[PDB]
Design a protein around this ligand. Sequence first.
Ligand SMILES: CCOC(=O)CN1CC(=O)Nc2ccccc21
Ligand SMILES: CCOC(=O)CN1CC(=O)Nc2ccccc21
Ligand SMILES: CCOC(=O)CN1CC(=O)Nc2ccccc21
Ligand SMILES: CCOC(=O)CN1CC(=O)Nc2ccccc21
Ligand SMILES: CCOC(=O)CN1CC(=O)Nc2ccccc21
Ligand SMILES: CCOC(=O)CN1CC(=O)Nc2ccccc21
Lengths: 216, 216, 216, 216, 216, 216
Amino acid sequence: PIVQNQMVHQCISPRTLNAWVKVVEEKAFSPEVIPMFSALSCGATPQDLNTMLNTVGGHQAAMQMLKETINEEAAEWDRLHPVHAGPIAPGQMREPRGSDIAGTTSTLQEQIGWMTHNPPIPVGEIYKRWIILGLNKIVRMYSPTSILDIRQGPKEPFRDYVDRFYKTLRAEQASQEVKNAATETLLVQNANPDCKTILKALGPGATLEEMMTACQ
Amino acid sequence: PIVQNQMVHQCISPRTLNAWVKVVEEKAFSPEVIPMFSALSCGATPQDLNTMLNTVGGHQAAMQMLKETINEEAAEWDRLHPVHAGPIAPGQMREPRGSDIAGTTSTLQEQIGWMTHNPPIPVGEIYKRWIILGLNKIVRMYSPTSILDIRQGPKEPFRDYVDRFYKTLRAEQASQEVKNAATETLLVQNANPDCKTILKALGPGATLEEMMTACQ
Amino acid sequence: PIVQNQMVHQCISPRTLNAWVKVVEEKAFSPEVIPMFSALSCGATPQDLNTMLNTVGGHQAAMQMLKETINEEAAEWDRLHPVHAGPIAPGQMREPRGSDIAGTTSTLQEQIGWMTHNPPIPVGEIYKRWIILGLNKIVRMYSPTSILDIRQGPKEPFRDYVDRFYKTLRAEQASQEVKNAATETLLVQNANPDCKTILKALGPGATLEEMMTACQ
Amino acid sequence: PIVQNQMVHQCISPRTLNAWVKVVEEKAFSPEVIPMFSALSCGATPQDLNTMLNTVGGHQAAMQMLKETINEEAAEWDRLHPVHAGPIAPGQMREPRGSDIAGTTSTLQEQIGWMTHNPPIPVGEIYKRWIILGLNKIVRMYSPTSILDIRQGPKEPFRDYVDRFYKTLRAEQASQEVKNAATETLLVQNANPDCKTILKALGPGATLEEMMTACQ
Amino acid sequence: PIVQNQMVHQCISPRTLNAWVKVVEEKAFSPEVIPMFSALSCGATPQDLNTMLNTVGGHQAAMQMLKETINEEAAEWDRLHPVHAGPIAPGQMREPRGSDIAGTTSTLQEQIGWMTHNPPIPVGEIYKRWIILGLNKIVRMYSPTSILDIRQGPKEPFRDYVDRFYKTLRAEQASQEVKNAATETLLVQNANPDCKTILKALGPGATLEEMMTACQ
Amino acid sequence: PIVQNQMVHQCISPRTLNAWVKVVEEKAFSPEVIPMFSALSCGATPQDLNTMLNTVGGHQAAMQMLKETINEEAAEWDRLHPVHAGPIAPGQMREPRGSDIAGTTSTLQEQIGWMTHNPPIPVGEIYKRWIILGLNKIVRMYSPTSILDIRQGPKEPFRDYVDRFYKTLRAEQASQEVKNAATETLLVQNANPDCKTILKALGPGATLEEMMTACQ
Ligand SMILES: CCOC(=O)CN1CC(=O)Nc2ccccc21
Ligand SMILES: CCOC(=O)CN1CC(=O)Nc2ccccc21
Ligand SMILES: CCOC(=O)CN1CC(=O)Nc2ccccc21
Ligand SMILES: CCOC(=O)CN1CC(=O)Nc2ccccc21
Ligand SMILES: CCOC(=O)CN1CC(=O)Nc2ccccc21
Ligand SMILES: CCOC(=O)CN1CC(=O)Nc2ccccc21
């Protein structure tokens, strides 16, 4: 990444290379892989981000959809920040284009220069915006199950049911407002009759905690 | 987190990301996960705390009750510390609101600035107060068993019994004063007749050690 | 803990949090857990010591006897070092009471200030004296077996027998003088007749090595 | 490698020695081993690169093809950058030849001097260009399967099929332009009739995501 | 231990605490545990050395023979370096006695002061001389087998035989001169007739390599 | 080893002690253990090198042949660099003899002084030349199989065959010139008739890659 003593380039740690590859091996594209990708790529250059992306042996369909999202993001970047053509002023910083931010056309030096400049041209954090927006499209994609098919078994503890509902809501990339709101509607509707009957009795303004105790 | 050389932002370590995720995988919401959460989040920014929270794939019902506790804590914060509306003085620190402390509306820079200021605006330690108060509500919730149903088997060693009692008392979030006091009452009542008879003989002012030897 | 560059507060390492929790999981309250507790808590604040104590999910009976030992040690502390009541001089160090040393009433800052002062008020090392004196009471308690019931099988190698004897002597918290002395008496008496006969032949002034060769 | 405090030689870490040897043991010459080799050899001297190469017990046929690629690259280097023969000016840097860049004729000191010079003679990064160009020839070689034999089973989920296609395309070292393009042609042709029929309906200008949803 | 930035006290690492305890668990008192003990106790204080010794749950007979060796070494120390009795000059370094070097009567501060002084009073390295001389007495003790009972099976490869011979010679603590010499005598005598006959043919001045090839 | 901040002695890491002992446990004297020994002993003193050597419990026949190689290398050293006899000039560096380089007669201080001097007397790198030349003699020794007995099975993939050939060539310590050359002769001769026939067709000037594709 880029880190502090001044701001200096550091080699991506075997610890970190490993941790990303194991997390993709174990959790595939489970929602919780995104906040963890972000965490393992703290202070990462575009070369670091390609390195983590490029170390994944499997999921080559997911990786390809990702190149697509990144071409589009690189394209939009070039539409909003066109770069001067012809020779760069000797010994001076040239502006980054989309493929420079993605790390396919920039060098580590170039990338270093952009991120360590005052004020910084933050190509690490910009590309990781691109990659993560792409990584979420893959999560919703690989979301196996609809929130409509998440219903409570007759003998299933309410707590186990709510875990599947919200795990599903999370993979289905539902906005926080539908997550705050999901409680008073589908969570109740989708509950079994014994529980459903308890929850209806509470009425509106019941919390998840109040809901989850009522049916424990 | 934020650490010392001056006070400087450091990348949350793969060691730490892993240790929190394994501890939730293994112990779920066993009481002892709280002091360990706190320990793994030493010097943590709100972004670090969201990162650890967001890396948990399971327990999405628990996570949702937690958003609730945090909205309430963010709300109370705004009720006591309202923030000036309109443009911030150029190049100056704006006050944090509830959602700034929770890390949903602040940036790492903003969060850095608050915690590294003299004297510090300690948003790491404030949000971790919020998260932990929420994490305890989940522990009592997921406390399977009442202290009334913790009784000593006829053939069960007193020591094994006291382990379940106090493990239970801990998950049931009983105050230290009921823990000091629990000895002279329920611990004896809930003991088996052979042991109960020994303990009654000791009378009052007997320690747990004296109690636990008497019945070994 | 508190460590050196000046003397500075450092975050308890995931390595260390883990190592203590694994050592309690594996060895429970085997004597050798004490010197290891001490080692893992090198330079530890009272908050670090509570953190290691509080991370133990099991042994809640042992933990409760420990609160007892610590209340008594905190009480004795207050009996010998009473603290001035009323407002602390602005910007000045207030004296620590028993519950300040135990970390239930002090803050990390307060604790930092005490230990980093010239000369230091060493609350880390004082509380760890308290905790360890309590942890030994638990070892003797959870000592399953008397040195009188450690006797050599007819077919058991003398070396295997002496391992059980001294392992037992150690859990039974016998003073070093009874350990130096245990050789010329019970070790011989408790040995089997074939070995006993050899050892008696040596007479007094025989070492453990001479004893252990004689019977190999 | 060579790292920063100035730029200083550091011992290749047991962590790194291990991580390369495990990655060759587990993944052999799967494409994703290349970006990972590169990552584990960050700031590496030619001696570091030989060290990682030389620690591989297996794949001695692959290693031998690699000596070949490196002799050719060393040869081309000498064809373009011939070195002055006879005595080097006392206390001065001599130019590197091909076998100096490969690390068979240079010393660590010599290699250090080249890479730490202003501006640097970057023999670490030059040899790793050589090694990696050789390592890709081995990947295409050890590519078991043609993209023509990657066809979708009647009962095989489209997503599983696209994973094999692009994993294959990657081992077969197809250029990014054939990867962008592979979608509108062979991916469809090679799909099963039920899916093929859906994809044909979309027509041209369909993305992989649109393709992959259409057939989910 | 004591390490450098000046010379400073460092906390014994969980890595090191663990590595010693695992090595005693796995290899017991196999000769090769000594050079490894020494290595794990690099820069160690007497408190560090007691800590590593005290963390061993098993082998309490071995540990007790070790207290004996250390009392004798502490005694000899006091016989050669008697210490002035009565009050130490205020703020000045008092001389170390045997039990001060063993760490039973010294403090970490006292021990720090001795080892960090110019020139150093090297109590770490002196006690580790004591402990290691004691640890070797335990190795010869726990040497199961005589070099006279190490003989080559009729069907046993000479190389396998020489491994047992020299492993035995090592546990039996034979001096290097008997190891240089052991070849021309017992190694041949103890070999089987087919091999013995080959080795006799070589005559004197044959190396182990020449011996070991002759019989491969 | 000896490392940089100046050049300073550092304690051999538990990581490194472990990594060498595991690599001998797993790979015994497979050729690839040599480049790995070298790597784990980066900046190592003679005491570090003895420490790694001395931590190996097994292979005592190999270790003994190694003492032999080192006595010979120490002897040759003394034949070429005889040392002045009688008292060393007070406070001055005495010259190293063979047994000083091997670390049997030198001290860590003495060894430190030699390696940290300007210009350095490089006893770490000299002894590791000795040890490695000895370690290769052991590899050829423990080479089970001749390159003449490495022949391709009728049904064995050419690639699998070439792996055994070159793995064998490597253990048999054949010079690089016989490795470059081994292709046009024995590799073909030793191949099976179906493959042999293909390879003969190529004629001379065929690469291993061309050879290995021809027969895939
Ligand atoms: C504008 C083009 O940008 C890219 O293709 C970025 N990229 C580079 C890479 O090396 N690997 C990679 C892997 C998956 C997704 C995108 C990448
Ligand atoms: C006022 C709103 O605050 C939050 O929702 C805080 N938060 C942010 C997050 O990223 N994850 C998260 C996970 C569980 C619980 C709370 C969070
Ligand atoms: C005077 C009161 O002191 C304490 O109770 C100390 N203490 C604090 C804690 O957090 N945990 C703990 C766990 C076991 C034993 C004592 C503690
Ligand atoms: C011009 C000659 O260069 C080399 O042979 C480079 N080389 C050196 C080495 O030590 N090992 C190695 C292992 C595989 C491939 C090339 C090497
Ligand atoms: C002169 C007395 O010295 C000692 O007993 C040294 N000692 C101290 C200790 O804490 N543990 C220990 C464990 C095994 C062997 C010796 C020790
Ligand atoms: C001239 C004598 O040198 C040596 O014997 C070097 N030596 C020292 C050692 O401690 N162990 C060792 C283990 C295997 C091989 C050589 C050693």
